[PDB]
Symmetry: D5
Subunit: 156 residues, 10 copies
């Protein structure tokens, strides 16, 4: 794939259309991703404009959602990424993940440099997943795993 | 503890002093937290102004870092939380965790509502840890686990 | 309900259409909510894009307001919440509630930590209501009750 | 009182000093306000730079907190109000009250105009209180009461 | 009137339409307000989306401007107020009134507290007018009168 | 006077010191400006960093407030004007004058162009004053007069 | 002219249409302003939404550009001025004039107060001219003349 | 000169000290620049932190203003330029020059491209000067000349 | 070329249409620029709204992409430059180039002043190119060359 | 090195002290880096707070600059990176590199995806250098080479 986008609104408008079709069809993201061979987090992100689907998966999810050919093509384009409307989320569900950075951002930095050294944990050589687990005290918990490669910063 | 702060600069100035003492003594966050009974991410966050230490832990880390009495008291106060200077990190290491929200924030929302329903994953009933693992392809990876309680949103 | 929105403009555009229909039919929010079994604050918030209606209530209010089937479905989706145009309200009526935060925000923090401890008053395990009472000195007062569960911040 | 402030940092610096004295003396805001004849929310707000104390109350809290004479005078000055560092709180405890506006701000406007009419609920002819109650399902809740006069907007 | 708006763009678009019709008909705001019994500043503000007209006045100005029935209805709705595009005006004529706040804002605060005490001059129990007077030195001046009730901030 | 400032903090720090001396001496702004030949709004603005006092007035108010020689000199310098901390006031008393602009800013523009033509009402050839009067319906009101020259915008 | 605009987008949309017509017709701004009796900077600013044309000039440029009657009337309206999209230009050509202010803004203030006294150089009683000259070292230079009335700030 | 600054506050603090010394000595910027062989706009800008003085001029002005050796050295350093506190000036005298950009910014772009072509008028190969002239209609005017080289944007 | 744009959305909307046509036709930017005699970075930038194509090149790329005549003309207009939506990129690929400025911006300044002197490296007399090379350890690297004229800052 | 900073002001204050010492000693960055075996861009960045020096280089440069032992230790700390005061540079020399992103940012994205695929050019596995070359048309040019590893974004 060598084609890419520069205006996020094209793929985000498509996402809204995908979401309406998905709601009318009573589909989950797990079943849309089923049969693609790709993780639900990756396929979902693509539908929402933040990843590119390979051609086979794009044709599969496009059939499930009754997308036209322009939209199946658009899902294969490399996106202009950035899902937050204006830098800080307003939605409570998304905001909590921003708050985690306001509370633990410097701890994440400190512990990364302690365990690995100078450098970063990659957001590119990176996967995440969301799992539901029972809480022993009652209710349910989400275990969200962020898995990134350490890239060192070295003198030159 | 019923005492709380309203100006983050007091605890953040203390954090700078702690970091200098820690560097002079060639100490790690893992060994500072050793013997407290508390997770390294929680103790580290407290040193950096983002949590309150119980009194015994405050006195233990205060002894290791040679802190004065006002500093040991300050570590026990409930903080005015918020570690980011101006909303969006400039530091590359911290920025990558913000970028994961720009790429996956709406996917986290969508999968949370799919698996749990309306509501949030708590940032309060919440634990974080950082683990170093070998990358089977060569090098090292960080596995960062966000573990939060699901709190539902229902009608009233 | 496992379906959710990612762009607030879809439901906010619907809210504008709902308000136009409501005005043309000379309807109040109290009477739109009548028969749903749900509090006026919750139903009103859903019409305005900030909550999800259960199917029976969505069909009821949709019939009252002569909404099409796509709109009745949209009212059932979990929203991308955030009603303020650009972070701080310009509207005087909305602004007064922001000003209460500018004046009393640190007092709310201080008294919450005093009475409950470290942690938060939840905005999720939460309900709100608005009551009109007579002012003994003449005129009318609004008594707005914010009712949220205390969630503690504990060491781990 | 005819004296007023124009730079919030003077009273906010005093607030930090008050908080340190309060912590060293193991005092609560309820204890400090006891004997003033004034509500704990009002006295706490004054200590935190957001209200002016009458002379007798300033002298009483100054004795309780071992404050010097310049500080006792400053507490009587009409403040430059505004407790939030930079418009939107970073602290989770304070942020939840901002989130309540992001979710319910337009609902509050709508219901105020329906029950009262055009105009505002005053933030000046206004009282706030924080009450701890039992959660009937287990735990504790905060009931926060915002009590403001309705001021109508009428043609002229 | 119990109907209210939440998106200012609806009434601001109507304002643009009103201004075109007004220009084609060579009408002044004084002429438009004539016969309503309402002040030119109030009627003008309503046309520009910042006040609600009573029904009789809305029908009168609507006939003068040849507005359709939905527009005459819209003029009667309680607006989402805020006329400035993005917080600080760019237009020189409007900017000068913002500059008077940058130069005299703290003087207004100081003199209000000196003459009245703690509290505010209301922007709700409030009237405004613009008058043209000859300058004794040559030319013309505007005398703009801001007339607001003092609302005290008292202890409770 | 040909000397001017470029950093507002110098004159604003002096204002804080002036306000402290004024509070200790139980002085009003009206009495500080008495004997000066200048309006209370002008002298007050100078004390608060927003105007320059002529030498005679600077010596008079400096004696009343027991200011040192450097301070009396500073009051005579042309200031770097701008009294609002960060563009939009947080203080309720100051904020109401900003809200008047959010509600009536476009009406002021429209009526200025109607009565005078294209151009501005000067914020430079400009005086203001604050008068306390009875509210005929009970209470007190402020009448604030903004008196500015019309400067036309003409083709060239 | 007593008619004015409150939303810059109306005249800025017209400016885009004017620019398209001008490009199709291979016209320059100098050619369009020729015969109006008005300076090229003034006429150009009017086409671009920042000035109002007298009726005769509006009809003339309307004929040259084949504009419709609504557009000819719009050009005569007093504009809602402000040509910069979001406060600071992104365009390099436009940005250089902003940088001139970042480098020389305080020097301009200092030298105006030295040569004239307290007050301003008017942006209203003001003319602007762009002249192309030879660079004696090779190439070309622009000599841009800002010609504004000094308005004094005097005590009252 | 190969030495440069990265934090504008160092040279801006020096500028404040220079302005105090200049005020105490009753010196003008014209007086200070006399004998340097450099334009008053250039020398003034250097004093205010926005240019570098050659060693001989730095020693000359430093003797006139009684500067210590560290300050005379600092004046020769290449600055971190940017004189506006926070992007848009609050001071009326400087604001008017920003306002001329808001009114004429797109006209400057348009006429530059018409007379010269694609590219910029340089802010580096650039000089400005301020001249006082009599107004034929009474009073005084400033003629501010911006003189910059055209640098073309060419295909490659 | 003397025709220029003032609203970037026109050329950016055209860029979106170009990108769709390009994707449908399976074309690369290298292929589109082939035969123009112009560098791929210059032609690509023009397609994306940030440069002006000479007429022959606009017609060549217009034929390849099947653009209409209005679009071929638009590509020849001098643009209103600025490709970033809101000042700081959200897209990871674009963001890394901003991060290089956050890490090395002051180093670039310091080394430019050391090697060249006071002044700038031009962004106008300027070429860039992107080269794909082998990483000598495994993988691929991009070598991005910024080539700009040094423009000195000297006294006048 | 496992020690890291969380507040950039510590190292940026040290940078200012370094720059003064460097100026007094008439040292270049090339001279300071000579003998370290490290690139001038890397050592300079470390002095300016944006990289960490190894102990041997920190001891060497600290001796050259007469730094105390706390400072030599601080230079070895992993920094809180981010050299721009407030997101967009004000300094012309730094601003030009930001302008290159405003003009070419989307072209860099487009050509990276064309040549390499989805993913990024790393800012971590990354080197930079500045070279001076003669301009054949007269004068000098800077060739700034950005050299980063391509990291792919792949499905998972």
């Amino acid at each position: 794939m060598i084609q890419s986008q520069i205006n996020r609104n094209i793929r985000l408008d498509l996402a809204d259309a995908i979401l309406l079709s998905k709601a009318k069809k009573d589909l989950s993201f797990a079943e849309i991703a089923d049969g693609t061979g790709l993780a639900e987090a990756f396929v979902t992100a693509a539908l929402l404009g933040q990843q590119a689907l390979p051609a086979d998966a794009a044709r599969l999810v496009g059939a499930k959602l009754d997308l036209d050919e322009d939209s199946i093509l658009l899902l294969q384009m490399i996106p202009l990424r950035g899902c937050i409307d204006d830098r800080i989320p307003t939605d409570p569900t998304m905001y909590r993940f921003y708050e985690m950075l306001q509370v633990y951002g410097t701890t994440l930095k400190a512990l990364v440099h302690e365990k690995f050294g100078d450098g970063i944990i990659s957001a590119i050589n990176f996967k995440l997943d969301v799992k539901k687990v029972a809480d022993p005290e009652g209710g349910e918990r989400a275990v969200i795993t962020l898995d990134g490669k350490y890239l060192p910063t070295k003198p030159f």
